[PDB]
Design an enzyme around this catalytic site. Sequence first.
Site, PDB file in Angstrom:
ATOM      1  N   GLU A 148      -6.629  -7.653  -4.884  1.00 13.55           N
ATOM      2  CA  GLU A 148      -6.681  -6.931  -3.622  1.00 13.55           C
ATOM      3  C   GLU A 148      -7.035  -7.841  -2.453  1.00 13.55           C
ATOM      4  O   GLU A 148      -7.754  -8.834  -2.597  1.00 13.55           O
ATOM      5  CB  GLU A 148      -7.702  -5.792  -3.697  1.00 13.55           C
ATOM      6  CG  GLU A 148      -7.674  -5.013  -5.007  1.00 13.55           C
ATOM      7  CD  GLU A 148      -8.667  -3.860  -5.031  1.00 13.55           C
ATOM      8  OE1 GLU A 148      -8.849  -3.198  -3.983  1.00 13.55           O
ATOM      9  OE2 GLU A 148      -9.277  -3.622  -6.097  1.00 13.55           O
ATOM     10  N   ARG A 198       0.817  -1.210   0.000  1.00 10.59           N
ATOM     11  CA  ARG A 198       0.000   0.000   0.000  1.00 10.59           C
ATOM     12  C   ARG A 198       0.854   1.264   0.000  1.00 10.59           C
ATOM     13  O   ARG A 198       1.669   1.476   0.904  1.00 10.59           O
ATOM     14  CB  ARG A 198      -0.950   0.001   1.201  1.00 10.59           C
ATOM     15  CG  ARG A 198      -1.694   1.306   1.426  1.00 10.59           C
ATOM     16  CD  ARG A 198      -2.932   1.097   2.286  1.00 10.59           C
ATOM     17  NE  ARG A 198      -3.637   2.345   2.567  1.00 10.59           N
ATOM     18  CZ  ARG A 198      -3.362   3.134   3.601  1.00 10.59           C
ATOM     19  NH1 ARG A 198      -2.398   2.798   4.444  1.00 10.59           N
ATOM     20  NH2 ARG A 198      -4.042   4.256   3.794  1.00 10.59           N
ATOM     21  N   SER A 204      -7.400  -0.968   2.471  1.00  9.39           N
ATOM     22  CA  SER A 204      -7.283  -1.550   1.138  1.00  9.39           C
ATOM     23  C   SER A 204      -5.818  -1.703   0.750  1.00  9.39           C
ATOM     24  O   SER A 204      -5.009  -0.797   0.967  1.00  9.39           O
ATOM     25  CB  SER A 204      -8.002  -0.680   0.113  1.00  9.39           C
ATOM     26  OG  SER A 204      -9.323  -1.127  -0.094  1.00  9.39           O
TER      27      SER A 204
HETATM   28  O1  LIG Z   1      -7.934   5.985   1.155  1.00  4.79           O
HETATM   29  C1  LIG Z   1      -7.455   4.996   1.770  1.00  4.79           C
HETATM   30  O2  LIG Z   1      -8.194   4.293   2.507  1.00  4.79           O
HETATM   31  C2  LIG Z   1      -5.975   4.647   1.629  1.00  4.79           C
HETATM   32  C3  LIG Z   1      -5.400   4.971   0.253  1.00  4.79           C
HETATM   33  C4  LIG Z   1      -5.196   3.704  -0.573  1.00  4.79           C
HETATM   34  N1  LIG Z   1      -6.238   3.145  -1.150  1.00  4.79           N
HETATM   35  C5  LIG Z   1      -6.126   2.033  -1.883  1.00  4.79           C
HETATM   36  S1  LIG Z   1      -7.175   1.086  -2.729  1.00  4.79           S
HETATM   37  C6  LIG Z   1      -6.075  -0.092  -3.319  1.00  4.79           C
HETATM   38  C7  LIG Z   1      -4.901   0.239  -2.871  1.00  4.79           C
HETATM   39  C8  LIG Z   1      -4.900   1.464  -2.035  1.00  4.79           C
HETATM   40  C9  LIG Z   1      -3.815   2.096  -1.402  1.00  4.79           C
HETATM   41  O3  LIG Z   1      -2.532   1.553  -1.531  1.00  4.79           O
HETATM   42  N2  LIG Z   1      -3.995   3.188  -0.692  1.00  4.79           N
HETATM   43  C10 LIG Z   1      -3.803  -0.641  -3.260  1.00  4.79           C
HETATM   44  C11 LIG Z   1      -4.570  -1.784  -4.184  1.00  4.79           C
HETATM   45  C12 LIG Z   1      -6.154  -1.288  -4.147  1.00  4.79           C
END
Ligand SMILES: O=C(O)CCc1nc2sc3c(c2c(=O)[nH]1)CCC3
EC number: 2.4.2.31
Lengths: 225, 225, 198, 198
Positions: free
Chosen positions: C149, C86, C110
């Site tokens: 994911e 992430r 996520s």
């Molecule tokens: O907004 C948030 O909750 C953290 C930001 C964030 N969102 C997502 S969605 C997703 C990923 C990701 C993320 O690395 N940070 C990585 C694969 C699918």
Amino acid sequence: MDKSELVQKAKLAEQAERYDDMAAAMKAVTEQGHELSNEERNLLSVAYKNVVGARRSSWRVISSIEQKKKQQMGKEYREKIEAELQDICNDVLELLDKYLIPNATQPESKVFYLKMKGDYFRYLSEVASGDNKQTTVSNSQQAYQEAFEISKKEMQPTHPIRLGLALNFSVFYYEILNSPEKACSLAKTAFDEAIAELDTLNEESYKDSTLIMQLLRDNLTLWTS
Amino acid sequence: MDKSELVQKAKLAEQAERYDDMAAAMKAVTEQGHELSNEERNLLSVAYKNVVGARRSSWRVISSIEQKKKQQMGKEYREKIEAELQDICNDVLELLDKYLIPNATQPESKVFYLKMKGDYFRYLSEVASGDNKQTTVSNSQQAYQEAFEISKKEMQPTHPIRLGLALNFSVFYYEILNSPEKACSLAKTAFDEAIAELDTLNEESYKDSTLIMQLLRDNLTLWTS
Amino acid sequence: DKALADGLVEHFGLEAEQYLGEHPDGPYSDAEVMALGLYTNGEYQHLNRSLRQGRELDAGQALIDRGMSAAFEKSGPAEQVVKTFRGTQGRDAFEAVKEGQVGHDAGYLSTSRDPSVARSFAGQGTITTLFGRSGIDVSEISIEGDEQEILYDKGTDMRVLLSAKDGQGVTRRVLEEATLGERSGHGEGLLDALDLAT
Amino acid sequence: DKALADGLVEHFGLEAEQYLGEHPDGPYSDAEVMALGLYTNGEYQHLNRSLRQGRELDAGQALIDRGMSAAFEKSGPAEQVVKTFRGTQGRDAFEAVKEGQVGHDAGYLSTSRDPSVARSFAGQGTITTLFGRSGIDVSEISIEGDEQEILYDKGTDMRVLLSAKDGQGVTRRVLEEATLGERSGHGEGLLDALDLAT
Ligand SMILES: O=C(O)CCc1nc2sc3c(c2c(=O)[nH]1)CCC3
Ligand SMILES: O=C(O)CCc1nc2sc3c(c2c(=O)[nH]1)CCC3
């Protein structure tokens, strides 16, 4: 080696945590045939204890695993530890009987050494078998109660050596003789004789003695529950 | 003794905290001339380390008191400790060179042993004098950098053996060669090559490797302040 | 609870029905599939932007969160430790945790197992790499960009095993689920056998 | 401060003047002598009965306490550890302290070094034996019954080295001033040399 050079070399093995050296180190100052002050009297006891307690902590573990598919060679290995302790105590008991027990001019050390001698008779009584099993305990209570009347009739109640002699005696009955009846019987007597005379404390070791008393109260109740 | 009986006896000396027995214990399974699994590979290293580190902790104290009125017999006593370590490392380095280094079929252990061999060349390099002082260090960097290209070209960056080899190497320059220029130079390189590839971690030792990295970051900054 | 399943079809419609038969096996319910799909990508950035800051939920997002957290006990864990990733545009909820201690986000977590989506996913400010089991393998329902994911809960506590900053200044970090801890992921005695300085 | 010295001669008179020239040397002031004498014996039982319970002071007793606590910094300490004693009619302010920890009274700590006044001094409920230096050797000003008294301060913290109860049920206790602690009163290595079970 001068009577004072070994003092430094004895202090070395302690700080260096090399008590096997400290064993033969303080062994020599007593082989000098002259009385040793409490400073050296403390170091030698601290030396052989840490050595014996080390092999003790080593032996006590093996004697739990074997009880708890071959394990003969484990007993065979436990035997060489038994051989170590036997060699140690009987060696130090001669040092007690040759240069320590008679040189006891001071009445205080007259109880510390006998207490210690009974301890090393108490130590050897665990790994023994048959011939020595009964024999070692005979001199154990012998030396123990021997210093006890000295501690009784000559020593103050709240005295570090007296109170410690009572504990190790109370532990000897519960452990060795497996007789908690007299073990608890001797601690309370000593414990009671201590609290009644609180003006008998010396400021030099007023805090040192209280700790001992904190142990006996934590052995009476423990044995009675 | 079977190749498996000594396993139990080796585990005994560890739990019993009798590593001097563990020294000759794991010494024999390697004298069998057959390759040893990582399980035994770990125990032997754990054995001789605790032994050498014990004498090391012993020697390092004497080398502080003498520096900090006779002290010749103190150096004379420190000398017998020097004699102990010298006897140990050179003994274990032959065990490395005879039954360990060639038997290294697995590429992983090809770096663990060379790292270890350089360590025991790094160990001996402190108590040495003149003849061995320069000589021991020659094979030290030899074996060190030798396993390093193996760790570089074959081993993953975030690998426990690789990251550990870099630390002990970075410590070798600052301690032995007293050259923090290249010491700091080698850690950052290794450290940097580690953080860029975080997907290179194995779940088997993902937490084990992070600890190593937590040490290098606490040595770079430490050396640069 | 079909009423919950209707909640999305009463508030999202063809959007919620986008995910439905996305299920060979079905350890999850009809309402659980559409909910997880709605978060995953992409109706989720504001599910956490509202969770964080302690702000109040919307109509639909409240219908999501409750359906989501419910499926967690119904899903986790099994079976061994995984390796997600992430990255962020800076400011992650683990920059205030001391190294070696445990801390939990307000919103969700996520993640992805693909190192490319790791570096990055808007933006490349702070990059992380996780370990656990209590994550929902949604690598079937919504794999936009082929992200494969796995999603953990919210107040799930993470152990910051490492926190450094890059040469170019991207803070890469390691994490670990609280309920693992201690000797969860250590070579059996390989550490003691290395011998070090410390 | 002669005004303080007048405070007692404006409120006690011949009582306060009972103590005055009770001083070969004089590390204390005129007002300090009469104040300590007024407490000691016997105008003191209500100085602590009012200190304890958090209750409000009287006119004269406020004039005492302030004169008393003032002389403490002007007196203590020197020079080695002493061995006072103190018995009570039950309920002492050290029955709630865990063994090995440190606790301080609300009121003062009048004591004696004579084991007879130790067992007792109304009553024989709870008996103690103290150690310190910060006590005011008043064994000259007021030795009613030949008690040879030494008086410590109030919020002075004591280390309960032992708390047992007698066969006949008199709780004998050991104490120790906070600022001693650690290896203050240990035979140099005599303990380690005994070897024990523990
Ligand atoms: O907004 C948030 O909750 C953290 C930001 C964030 N969102 C997502 S969605 C997703 C990923 C990701 C993320 O690395 N940070 C990585 C694969 C699918
Ligand atoms: O009331 C109190 O503050 C504690 C009770 C108490 N008072 C006194 S005065 C005095 C002693 C004493 C005491 O033991 N308890 C012993 C020698 C002179």
